[PDB]
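Researcher: Going back to the complex we discussed earlier. I've cleaned up the inputs and rechecked each line, so this should be the final set. Can you rerun the prediction on the complete assembly and write out the structure?
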Amino acid sequence: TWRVYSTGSNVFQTRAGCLIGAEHVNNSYECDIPIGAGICASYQTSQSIIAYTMSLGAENSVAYSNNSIAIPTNFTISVTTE
Amino acid sequence: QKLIANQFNSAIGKIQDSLSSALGKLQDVVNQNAQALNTLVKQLSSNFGAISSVLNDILSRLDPPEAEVQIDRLITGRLQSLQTYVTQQLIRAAEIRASANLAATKMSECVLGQSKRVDFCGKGYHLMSFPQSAPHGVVFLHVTYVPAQEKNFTTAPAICHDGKAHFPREGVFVSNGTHWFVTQRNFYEPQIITTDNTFVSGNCDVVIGIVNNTVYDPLQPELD
Amino acid sequence: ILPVSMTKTSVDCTMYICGDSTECSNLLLQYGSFCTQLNRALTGIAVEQDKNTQEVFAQVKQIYKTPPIKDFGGFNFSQILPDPSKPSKRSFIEDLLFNKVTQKFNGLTVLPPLLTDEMIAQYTSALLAGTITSGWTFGAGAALQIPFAMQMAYRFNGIGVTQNVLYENQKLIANQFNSAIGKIQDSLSSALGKLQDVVNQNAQALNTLVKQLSSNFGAISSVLNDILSRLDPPEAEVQIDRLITGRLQSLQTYVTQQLIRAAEIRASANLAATKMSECVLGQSKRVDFCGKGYHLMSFPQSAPHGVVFLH
Ligand SMILES: *[C@@H]1O[C@H](CO)[C@@H](O)[C@H](O)[C@H]1NC(C)=O
Ligand SMILES: *[C@@H]1O[C@H](CO)[C@@H](O)[C@H](O)[C@H]1NC(C)=O
Ligand SMILES: *[C@@H]1O[C@H](CO)[C@@H](O)[C@H](O)[C@H]1NC(C)=O
Ligand SMILES: *[C@@H]1O[C@H](CO)[C@@H](O)[C@H](O)[C@H]1NC(C)=O
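Model: Rerun complete. Updated structure for the full complex:
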């Protein structure tokens, strides 16, 4: 049964077992297809299945100080479905 | 009021075209129940180790005494198929019951009220919610206030004036870099610091951060 | 302490019932869909564990960072903030929690969770940094900075005590807080029975499912290679069918009880997710919902398959 995908071309050992046919990249993105143990895969790329460690969100440092406050000067009314 | 009404009317338009573009939670309970019935029906054609899965082709073929042991295998496998289906329906019904209890309390607390429970009635501060009917479900449109366009200010716990520590009644003390004001906390609206938007407690020594601004008194200017 | 997930176990019912035997496999086909319906059920349990974990911890969009200067008005968070010096960027109290809590060849397996413990520690550190630097504001919209003593003064107004009662007592309040955190840290060095019971129940169930392979169910032997070695085919089949029926009933029992456990873990995860929104991203007026006494604030800490709230 199918001798392609036995190949050494794109092979990546993961804690989820052995992944074949996906290009491992040093970048991070939001999870598209979940593989497991922090790894996800996507077509985002002349285009290929990539595999990556997922990003959890944009990193942010709050401008905290013992005498600084931020106050809103406007608002948005928003409507959201559940 | 015009701006708030336009933001609301615009946001309803976004819902309307987003639904015109999903209802995956309502669809997947329909899919699960259809798949379970389709499986229950398909079990009938399996043999369970009998010579066939068709009762008449047992009965028209065998003597009754040998038919009994062939039939008894079909009884057993069918009974087990049915019993499996009913058990999974009981478990899935308990999940729908939990979802209906959530929807019922969500209607009392978000539609018949205004909720202070964070994230219970959508993201941001809850204003109100509207129900819409859906097949085997409900949709809530939650309306919320989201604060926008922050500015930085310097701030202080208290003002020291006449050797007394003054605290804001509702707001916070803020400075634009040269002047001090008191503002409500969720929307910048600076006002003159006075005896009438502050209260006093003790002298200036105990509070960790405290600043020497004046406090105005609106009953001082009168001459008689 | 609340459990949030359970181990993502999975079983190939064909290898469990039959091992290598094609003879057993061709008999098992006579029972129709049962082995497909069982795999569908276990994979349904498994994807729900990642959903449970995501709904508890992934409540923040930004990964908020603490400032480098810990000027929180005398309150000391060092025991709850992450240690940068450890191999895992994990809290002192989270390391302490992760120390307290404690077959494959039969077609049993364990799938890994989607988020690692490193990622769950990242999310809880972001929730800590959000609350400590910005109060409840990061729950409603953008994080707005506020000085920590002024945030605690709002929380006093929230329980119906005037702000001056905080500022006049700030030294005492910070000392009582710092001491109470130290007392938790000592107490945890002594239990996590809520989490350990979920581990024990699942281990007891897998252990039983393995033990049932040794039962003969009235067949000549429980080793189907021994049956198939001693008897010719028409007599081997009636023996193998006794093992097939006993092993099917054993799997069916196991999968039914895993569906029932998953439902109460789902309820516990929905409670934990609610409790994070209402007790961590806000101040709650619901009596006893966020610990006993009037609620000021609370801090999440990760634990193996669970969450700990410091109320
Ligand atoms: C508030 O937001 C609306 C919509 O962007 C804008 O039209 C209005 O001018 C803003 N007002 C202020 C004071 O920024
Ligand atoms: C507040 O001031 C800090 C320091 O200058 C800056 O990093 C931050 O972006 C400012 N925030 C706003 C809302 O202007
Ligand atoms: C602060 O506000 C007062 C309002 O009258 C104004 O006169 C002053 O110029 C403002 N200072 C700055 C730095 O904006
Ligand atoms: C505040 O005012 C009092 C009275 O003039 C003075 O003793 C004190 O040093 C002042 N403190 C500051 C920080 O200006």
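Model: Worth noting: Chain C touches chain A at residues 50, 58, 60-65, 67, 71, 73, 111-116, 118-119, 122-123, 126, 129-130, 133-134, 141, 143-147, 150 (CB under 8 Å).
Researcher: Good, that matches what I expected from the previous run.
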